[PDB]
Amino acid sequence: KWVIDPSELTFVQEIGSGQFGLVHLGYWLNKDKVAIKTIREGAMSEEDFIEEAEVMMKLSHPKLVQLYGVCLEQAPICLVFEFMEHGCLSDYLRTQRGLFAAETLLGMCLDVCEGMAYLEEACVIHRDLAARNCLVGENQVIKVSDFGMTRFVLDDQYTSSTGTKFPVKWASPEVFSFSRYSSKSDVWSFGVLMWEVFSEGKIPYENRSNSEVVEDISTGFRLYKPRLASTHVYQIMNHCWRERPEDRPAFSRLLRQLAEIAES
Ligand SMILES: CCCOc1ccc2cccc(-n3cc(NC(N)=O)c(C(N)=O)n3)c2c1
């Protein structure tokens, strides 16, 4: 089942402090080494989350971080994930800047695109795909995490398109205008993620306010080609940033296109 009893978990070492609380390296009884995320009370709609657990726990892919279960006996609840030794992709790119071969950066995009094609096939919309949400594991494999989690986030400043903390930098126009989420709006976010990877972790639209990003995108501005991205890779990024969702490629199409470039 998705319920993990407190007696089936041991907390070993604090590894960090996330949005909802602390992250620990620990062990899960008779199973494996895990990452345990403690969720502050009031951060999430726990009842809505728990309700979807039996169905959503079944999602599994080598390029998705597995969320094994929830320890909910007492508050604050804990989420139990597969352990990702090298942490988040955004920090990994920034710390290893200047040491990446262009083929490795393309490979990182392919790992994310593969996990996203699995979600697209399963009709699961991420809603906030970014390098900060991707994790780096054994042999520098990239896996997507936190897909669909903004549906449970109780801070309206992050979830509402007009919210002060709304992740506008990764939002397609129909998302930033109407919260019209789809795999095609995840494709737009994926294009921004490809730019974060090829820029070795630079912040997209670093020089702009949320309203300025909205005004720039609406008038045709697009993120500049990173030095490490080839013109062919940049062409794929721009396809992700087409104004109409219908004109953007599906992740299934992007995966075939990016693989052809990687294996050529
Ligand atoms: C506690 C068992 C998992 O329960 C849920 C419940 C609701 C969910 C709603 C959206 C997405 C979920 N979700 C998130 C996951 N992984 C991750 N790294 O974020 C998984 C998975 N199967 O690995 N499922 C959910 C997972």
Short mmCIF file of C-alpha atoms and ligand atoms in Angstrom, two decimals:
data_model
loop_
_atom_site.label_atom_id
_atom_site.label_comp_id
_atom_site.label_asym_id
_atom_site.label_seq_id
_atom_site.Cartn_x
_atom_site.Cartn_y
_atom_site.Cartn_z
CA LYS A 1 0.00 0.00 0.00
CA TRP A 2 0.93 3.68 -0.21
CA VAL A 3 0.76 4.16 3.66
CA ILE A 4 4.18 3.81 5.37
CA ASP A 5 4.10 3.39 9.18
CA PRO A 6 6.53 5.61 11.24
CA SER A 7 8.21 2.33 12.43
CA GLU A 8 9.16 1.50 8.78
CA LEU A 9 11.32 4.66 8.43
CA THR A 10 14.61 5.73 10.00
CA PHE A 11 15.93 9.31 9.57
CA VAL A 12 19.72 9.29 9.12
CA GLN A 13 20.94 12.69 7.91
CA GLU A 14 19.41 16.07 7.05
CA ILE A 15 20.16 16.71 3.38
CA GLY A 16 18.28 20.01 2.96
CA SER A 17 15.36 22.39 3.53
CA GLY A 18 12.74 22.49 0.76
CA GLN A 19 9.59 24.61 0.25
CA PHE A 20 7.39 22.42 2.52
CA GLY A 21 10.04 21.64 5.17
CA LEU A 22 13.07 19.40 5.63
CA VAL A 23 14.54 16.67 3.41
CA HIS A 24 16.37 13.72 5.05
CA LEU A 25 18.38 10.78 3.79
CA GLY A 26 16.94 7.69 5.46
CA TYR A 27 16.05 4.02 5.15
CA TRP A 28 12.71 2.35 4.44
CA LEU A 29 12.21 -1.03 6.17
CA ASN A 30 13.00 -4.10 3.98
CA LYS A 31 13.12 -1.85 0.90
CA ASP A 32 15.89 0.74 0.31
CA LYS A 33 17.78 3.98 1.05
CA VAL A 34 15.22 6.84 0.58
CA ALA A 35 14.78 10.64 0.50
CA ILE A 36 12.14 11.67 3.10
CA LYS A 37 10.43 15.06 2.69
CA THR A 38 8.62 16.46 5.75
CA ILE A 39 5.57 18.57 4.77
CA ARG A 40 4.67 21.53 7.02
CA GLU A 41 1.00 21.58 8.11
CA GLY A 42 -1.01 23.97 5.89
CA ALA A 43 1.42 23.69 2.91
CA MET A 44 -0.73 21.11 1.06
CA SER A 45 -4.28 19.75 0.71
CA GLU A 46 -3.31 16.37 2.24
CA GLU A 47 -6.81 14.85 1.88
CA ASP A 48 -6.90 15.57 -1.92
CA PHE A 49 -3.40 14.10 -2.23
CA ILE A 50 -4.16 10.89 -0.17
CA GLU A 51 -7.36 10.36 -2.27
CA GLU A 52 -5.35 10.01 -5.51
CA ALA A 53 -2.55 7.82 -3.98
CA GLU A 54 -3.76 4.31 -4.98
CA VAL A 55 -4.00 5.37 -8.67
CA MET A 56 -0.98 7.77 -8.90
CA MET A 57 1.47 5.48 -7.03
CA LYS A 58 1.24 3.08 -10.04
CA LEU A 59 3.08 5.61 -12.31
CA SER A 60 6.62 4.26 -12.74
CA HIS A 61 9.44 4.99 -15.22
CA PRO A 62 13.30 4.95 -15.15
CA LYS A 63 13.22 8.73 -15.86
CA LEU A 64 10.66 9.60 -13.12
CA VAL A 65 11.66 9.87 -9.42
CA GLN A 66 9.54 7.17 -7.69
CA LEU A 67 7.34 8.47 -4.81
CA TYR A 68 6.97 5.23 -2.76
CA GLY A 69 4.46 6.33 -0.19
CA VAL A 70 3.34 8.62 2.61
CA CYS A 71 3.88 8.47 6.39
CA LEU A 72 0.76 10.16 7.77
CA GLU A 73 0.23 8.71 11.31
CA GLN A 74 0.82 12.14 12.87
CA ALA A 75 1.42 15.69 11.66
CA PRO A 76 3.68 16.75 9.97
CA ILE A 77 3.29 14.08 7.24
CA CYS A 78 6.33 12.71 5.27
CA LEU A 79 6.68 11.86 1.53
CA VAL A 80 9.07 8.93 0.78
CA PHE A 81 10.99 9.05 -2.50
CA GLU A 82 13.66 7.18 -4.39
CA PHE A 83 17.08 8.69 -3.32
CA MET A 84 18.75 10.93 -5.95
CA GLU A 85 22.42 11.18 -4.93
CA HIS A 86 23.35 14.35 -6.88
CA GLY A 87 20.34 16.50 -5.87
CA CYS A 88 18.41 18.97 -8.04
CA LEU A 89 19.40 19.61 -11.65
CA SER A 90 19.39 23.45 -11.29
CA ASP A 91 22.08 23.27 -8.51
CA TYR A 92 23.99 20.46 -10.35
CA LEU A 93 24.28 22.56 -13.57
CA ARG A 94 25.42 25.65 -11.58
CA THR A 95 28.09 23.75 -9.52
CA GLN A 96 29.44 21.76 -12.54
CA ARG A 97 29.35 24.82 -14.97
CA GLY A 98 32.23 24.73 -17.51
CA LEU A 99 32.66 20.91 -17.12
CA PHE A 100 29.81 19.80 -19.42
CA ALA A 101 30.29 18.38 -22.90
CA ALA A 102 27.45 19.45 -25.27
CA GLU A 103 26.52 15.73 -25.66
CA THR A 104 25.96 15.41 -21.83
CA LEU A 105 23.64 18.50 -21.83
CA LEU A 106 21.69 17.01 -24.76
CA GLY A 107 21.58 13.68 -22.85
CA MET A 108 20.10 15.45 -19.78
CA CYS A 109 17.34 16.94 -22.04
CA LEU A 110 16.68 13.44 -23.49
CA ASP A 111 16.29 11.88 -19.99
CA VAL A 112 13.71 14.62 -19.11
CA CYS A 113 11.95 14.30 -22.52
CA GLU A 114 11.69 10.48 -22.05
CA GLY A 115 10.09 10.83 -18.56
CA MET A 116 7.76 13.54 -19.94
CA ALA A 117 6.72 11.34 -22.95
CA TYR A 118 5.76 8.65 -20.37
CA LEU A 119 3.62 11.26 -18.46
CA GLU A 120 2.11 12.58 -21.70
CA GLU A 121 1.09 8.95 -22.71
CA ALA A 122 -0.42 8.48 -19.19
CA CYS A 123 -2.30 11.84 -19.53
CA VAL A 124 -0.49 13.25 -16.47
CA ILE A 125 0.25 17.01 -16.67
CA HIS A 126 3.30 18.17 -14.71
CA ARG A 127 2.23 21.91 -14.46
CA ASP A 128 5.59 23.21 -13.14
CA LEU A 129 8.38 21.43 -15.04
CA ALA A 130 11.72 23.20 -14.44
CA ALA A 131 15.38 22.24 -13.74
CA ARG A 132 14.65 22.88 -9.96
CA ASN A 133 12.12 19.94 -10.13
CA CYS A 134 14.46 17.53 -11.88
CA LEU A 135 16.89 15.38 -9.87
CA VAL A 136 20.28 13.85 -10.72
CA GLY A 137 20.91 10.23 -9.75
CA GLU A 138 23.34 7.37 -10.30
CA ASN A 139 25.57 7.91 -13.34
CA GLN A 140 24.17 11.47 -13.69
CA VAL A 141 20.79 10.20 -14.96
CA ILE A 142 18.06 12.91 -14.84
CA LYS A 143 14.58 12.10 -13.51
CA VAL A 144 11.45 14.30 -13.39
CA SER A 145 9.80 14.84 -9.97
CA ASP A 146 6.85 16.74 -8.35
CA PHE A 147 4.56 16.29 -11.39
CA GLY A 148 1.01 17.44 -10.65
CA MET A 149 1.94 18.65 -7.10
CA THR A 150 0.82 22.32 -7.65
CA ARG A 151 -2.81 20.93 -7.65
CA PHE A 152 -2.32 20.40 -3.86
CA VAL A 153 -0.22 23.56 -3.01
CA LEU A 154 -2.31 25.74 -0.67
CA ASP A 155 -0.37 29.00 -1.21
CA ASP A 156 -2.55 30.87 -3.75
CA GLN A 157 0.44 33.21 -4.44
CA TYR A 158 2.17 30.29 -6.21
CA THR A 159 -0.85 28.56 -7.79
CA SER A 160 -2.95 31.47 -9.17
CA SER A 161 -1.72 32.93 -12.55
CA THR A 162 -2.05 36.43 -10.97
CA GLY A 163 -0.21 35.17 -7.82
CA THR A 164 2.89 37.17 -6.72
CA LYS A 165 5.04 33.94 -6.77
CA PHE A 166 3.46 32.31 -9.87
CA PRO A 167 6.18 30.43 -11.85
CA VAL A 168 5.63 32.63 -14.94
CA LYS A 169 9.20 31.96 -16.38
CA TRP A 170 8.18 28.36 -17.32
CA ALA A 171 4.52 29.21 -18.23
CA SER A 172 3.09 29.10 -21.79
CA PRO A 173 0.76 32.10 -22.68
CA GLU A 174 -2.42 30.01 -22.13
CA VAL A 175 -1.07 29.01 -18.68
CA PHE A 176 -0.03 32.54 -17.60
CA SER A 177 -3.31 33.97 -19.02
CA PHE A 178 -5.87 31.23 -18.11
CA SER A 179 -4.23 28.35 -16.18
CA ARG A 180 -5.08 26.25 -19.29
CA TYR A 181 -2.76 23.31 -18.45
CA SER A 182 -1.97 20.47 -20.90
CA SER A 183 0.94 18.32 -22.10
CA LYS A 184 1.43 21.16 -24.66
CA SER A 185 1.94 23.73 -21.86
CA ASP A 186 4.42 21.20 -20.29
CA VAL A 187 6.16 21.26 -23.75
CA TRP A 188 6.62 25.05 -23.38
CA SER A 189 8.09 24.51 -19.84
CA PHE A 190 10.33 21.78 -21.34
CA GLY A 191 11.71 24.31 -23.87
CA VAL A 192 12.59 26.65 -20.93
CA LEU A 193 14.12 23.64 -19.08
CA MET A 194 16.29 22.86 -22.27
CA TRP A 195 17.47 26.51 -22.10
CA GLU A 196 18.30 26.17 -18.35
CA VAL A 197 20.36 22.97 -19.19
CA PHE A 198 22.20 24.47 -22.24
CA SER A 199 22.89 27.72 -20.24
CA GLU A 200 24.41 25.50 -17.47
CA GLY A 201 21.84 26.68 -14.91
CA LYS A 202 21.35 30.42 -15.66
CA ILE A 203 17.95 31.84 -14.53
CA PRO A 204 15.59 32.47 -17.50
CA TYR A 205 14.53 36.15 -17.95
CA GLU A 206 16.77 37.06 -14.95
CA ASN A 207 16.43 40.79 -15.81
CA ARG A 208 12.55 40.77 -15.80
CA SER A 209 9.55 41.13 -13.47
CA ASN A 210 6.61 38.68 -13.89
CA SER A 211 4.54 41.28 -15.84
CA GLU A 212 7.60 42.07 -18.05
CA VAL A 213 8.00 38.29 -18.90
CA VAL A 214 4.25 38.23 -19.83
CA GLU A 215 4.63 41.43 -21.97
CA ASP A 216 7.85 40.17 -23.66
CA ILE A 217 6.45 36.68 -24.47
CA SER A 218 3.14 38.20 -25.75
CA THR A 219 5.06 40.47 -28.12
CA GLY A 220 7.34 37.72 -29.55
CA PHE A 221 10.45 37.83 -27.31
CA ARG A 222 12.10 34.43 -26.81
CA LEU A 223 15.13 33.36 -24.71
CA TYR A 224 18.45 33.85 -26.59
CA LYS A 225 20.35 30.83 -27.89
CA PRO A 226 22.81 29.52 -25.22
CA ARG A 227 26.42 29.29 -26.53
CA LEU A 228 26.43 25.45 -25.95
CA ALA A 229 23.16 24.83 -27.87
CA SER A 230 23.60 24.10 -31.60
CA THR A 231 21.32 25.89 -34.09
CA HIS A 232 19.46 22.53 -34.49
CA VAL A 233 18.87 22.24 -30.69
CA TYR A 234 17.81 25.90 -30.52
CA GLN A 235 15.34 25.26 -33.40
CA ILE A 236 13.75 22.49 -31.18
CA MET A 237 13.61 24.97 -28.17
CA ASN A 238 11.76 27.54 -30.31
CA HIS A 239 9.27 24.82 -31.40
CA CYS A 240 8.43 24.39 -27.68
CA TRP A 241 7.76 28.16 -27.50
CA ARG A 242 5.16 28.43 -30.24
CA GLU A 243 2.32 30.72 -29.15
CA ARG A 244 -0.42 28.23 -30.15
CA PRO A 245 -0.29 24.93 -28.08
CA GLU A 246 -1.52 23.02 -31.22
CA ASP A 247 1.68 24.10 -33.12
CA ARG A 248 4.02 22.78 -30.39
CA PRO A 249 5.37 19.24 -30.86
CA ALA A 250 4.12 16.46 -28.54
CA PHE A 251 6.80 15.01 -26.16
CA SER A 252 6.58 11.79 -28.33
CA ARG A 253 7.64 13.90 -31.38
CA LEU A 254 10.36 15.87 -29.45
CA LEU A 255 11.81 12.54 -28.11
CA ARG A 256 12.26 11.15 -31.68
CA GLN A 257 13.69 14.52 -32.90
CA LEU A 258 16.16 14.93 -29.99
CA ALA A 259 17.23 11.22 -30.21
CA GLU A 260 17.97 11.61 -33.92
CA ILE A 261 20.25 14.61 -33.08
CA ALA A 262 21.94 12.74 -30.13
CA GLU A 263 22.55 9.53 -32.13
CA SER A 264 23.59 11.21 -35.45
C1 LIG B 1 1.94 8.35 -1.54
C2 LIG B 1 1.81 7.56 -2.84
C3 LIG B 1 1.79 8.49 -4.05
O1 LIG B 1 0.58 9.23 -3.93
C4 LIG B 1 0.37 10.22 -4.83
C5 LIG B 1 -0.88 10.88 -4.66
C6 LIG B 1 -1.23 11.89 -5.51
C7 LIG B 1 -0.36 12.29 -6.56
C8 LIG B 1 -0.72 13.34 -7.44
C9 LIG B 1 0.13 13.75 -8.43
C10 LIG B 1 1.38 13.11 -8.60
C11 LIG B 1 1.73 12.09 -7.76
N1 LIG B 1 3.01 11.47 -7.95
C12 LIG B 1 4.24 12.11 -7.82
C13 LIG B 1 5.20 11.11 -8.01
N2 LIG B 1 6.58 11.18 -8.01
C14 LIG B 1 7.28 12.37 -7.76
N3 LIG B 1 8.66 12.28 -7.79
O2 LIG B 1 6.71 13.45 -7.52
C15 LIG B 1 4.46 9.90 -8.26
C16 LIG B 1 5.03 8.58 -8.52
N4 LIG B 1 4.17 7.55 -8.84
O3 LIG B 1 6.25 8.38 -8.45
N5 LIG B 1 3.12 10.15 -8.22
C17 LIG B 1 0.88 11.65 -6.70
C18 LIG B 1 1.24 10.60 -5.82
#
